[PDB]
């Protein structure tokens, strides 16, 4: 295989926490850059766009461990911790943060991995994890910032109910009962456009499907409303700077 | 080594780790046993007897956590969030719990981080539903509660049912009857208010019983000691001997 990879156009759709089990992680956020080694934790503010360069330690193994917080769970943390702590602008050091993982936490993380669909015990274990972190002040700010719902999210959340649907601005306009114009403007106010949001959401999904049981490219291509498997690989590659195959191989 | 201790009333939710003791709990006339190395979950407001057996004599038999006002107020909003929408319980401790316990002990006066350590621990115990429910129960505010606060304004002060009437600008009948609908009496509340302060003070400093007797508003030091032994089934002396 190969131990280095570089991936672009990575929007963080949901607050993500990374533990660099097996890899050293260089994150290019805007004109800034940020580095995560080895046994360590990374907090990624919802809604950042990045490039990343990942160097593996062991090539038999998957470069890091990932926690995506769905919107329910993110809402629960935020409220919880804003009662427990509180609200004593934001760039770089406030969005992407790292911290050293002592053996205590390492095993807390192991427990958090076990907890697929047990959100009770997961939000619990996370509150505690965060209680063990220095400069958790900015994590909790970061969670506040990540809770804010934008119209973009409203759109995305609809789209994402079925990505394979053949979505058009015209359709979405209709979903909001608002003029086609309005949608494009509301998005522009939030510095995006529909077809972009659609690209993103598809390519995200595409990527998450690869990393699974796995399906074939046609399947996945179909699953995200793309016609040609050959064609999909093209857009995917242009988007992440890698083909679906390279990517699966690196991660699965 | 071994001691038997009676009529122990819990004002604020309590957990045990039986680090260095095997603990046999009489709740009602059921008797419950926690072997060495066990967690124990104790509804606020309960009255029990315990028989405590130390393994090593140079340690305190156990670790006890008693929860204050802020803490359980926060738990409620918070665990309500995390769960959403059966008095004494015991359970086994793995290495994970065991360490968290340690860290709980080290959050001397850290609200935020203890609250947090706690929430997680709860979530790691089977049938915690019951433990969370026990925490619901303990959050509810009663009249007995309001009284104790007022009694606690100053334990040494000369409380009579008559003076309490004065203090709430209400009849003495109101007082005793609101308690009777809660199936308790003023002197039991006053008993345990004083016996609480007393038992706690014994282990805190090595201050004289005279001082303590002053502190809880008892005129005779002789009088105190006999109330104590009749309450807890051991004298002030043996009790300090055991736990310190």
UniProtKB/Swiss-Prot annotation, chain A:
PROSITE patterns, per the entry: HTH_ARAC_FAMILY_1, HTH_ARAC_FAMILY_2
MF annotations from Gene Ontology: DNA-binding transcription factor activity; sequence-specific DNA binding
SUPFAM superfamilies referenced in this protein's UniProt entry, alphabetically: Homeodomain-like (SSF46689)
Keywords of the record: Activator, DNA-binding, Plasmid, Transcription, Transcription regulation
DNA-binding region: 170-191, 217-240
Subunit annotation: Homodimer.
Its biological purpose: Transcriptional activator of fimbrial genes in enterotoxigenic E.coli.
The protein's name: HTH-type transcriptional activator CsvR
Native organism: Escherichia coli
Organismal lineage: Bacteria, Pseudomonadati, Pseudomonadota, Gammaproteobacteria, Enterobacterales
Curated annotation (Swiss-Prot), chain B:
Alphabetical keyword list: Activator, DNA-binding, Plasmid, Transcription, Transcription regulation
Organism: Escherichia coli
Stated name of the protein: HTH-type transcriptional activator CsvR
Complex and partners: Homodimer.
SUPFAM superfamilies documented for this protein: Homeodomain-like
KW Transcription regulation (keyword) present: yes
Function: Transcriptional activator of fimbrial genes in enterotoxigenic E.coli.
Record-level Gene Ontology MF annotations: DNA-binding transcription factor activity; sequence-specific DNA binding
DNA-binding residue intervals: 162-183, 209-232
């Amino acid at each position: 295989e190969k131990e280095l990879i570089k991936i672009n156009n990575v929007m963080i759709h949901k607050y993500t926490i990374l533990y660099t089990s097996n890899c050293i992680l260089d994150i290019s956020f805007g004109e800034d850059k940020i580095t995560c080694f080895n046994n360590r934790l990374v907090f990624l503010e919802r809604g950042v766009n990045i490039s990343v360069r990942i160097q593996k330690q062991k090539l038999t193994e998957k470069p890091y461990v990932a926690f995506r917080l769905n919107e329910n769970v993110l809402r629960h943390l935020k409220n919880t911790l804003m009662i427990i702590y509180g609200m004593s602008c934001r760039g770089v050091s406030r969005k992407i943060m790292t911290t050293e993982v002592d053996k205590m936490l390492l095993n807390v993380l192991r427990e958090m991995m076990g907890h697929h669909n047990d959100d009770s015990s997961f939000i619990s274990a996370l509150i505690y994890l965060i209680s063990k972190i220095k400069c958790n002040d900015k994590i909790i700010e970061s969670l506040y910032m990540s809770s804010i719902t934008f119209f973009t999210d409203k759109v995305r959340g609809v789209i994402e109910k079925d990505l394979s649907r053949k979505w058009t601005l015209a359709i979405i306009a209709d979903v909001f009962n608002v003029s086609e114009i309005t949608i494009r403007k509301r998005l522009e106010s939030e510095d995006t456009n529909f077809n972009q949001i659609l690209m993103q959401s598809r390519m995200s999904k595409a990527a998450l499907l690869l990393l699974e049981n796995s399906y074939q490219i046609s399947q996945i291509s179909n699953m995200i409303g793309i016609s040609s498997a050959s064609y999909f690989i093209r857009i995917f590659n242009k988007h992440f700077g890698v083909t679906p195959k390279q990517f699966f191989n690196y991660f699965k």
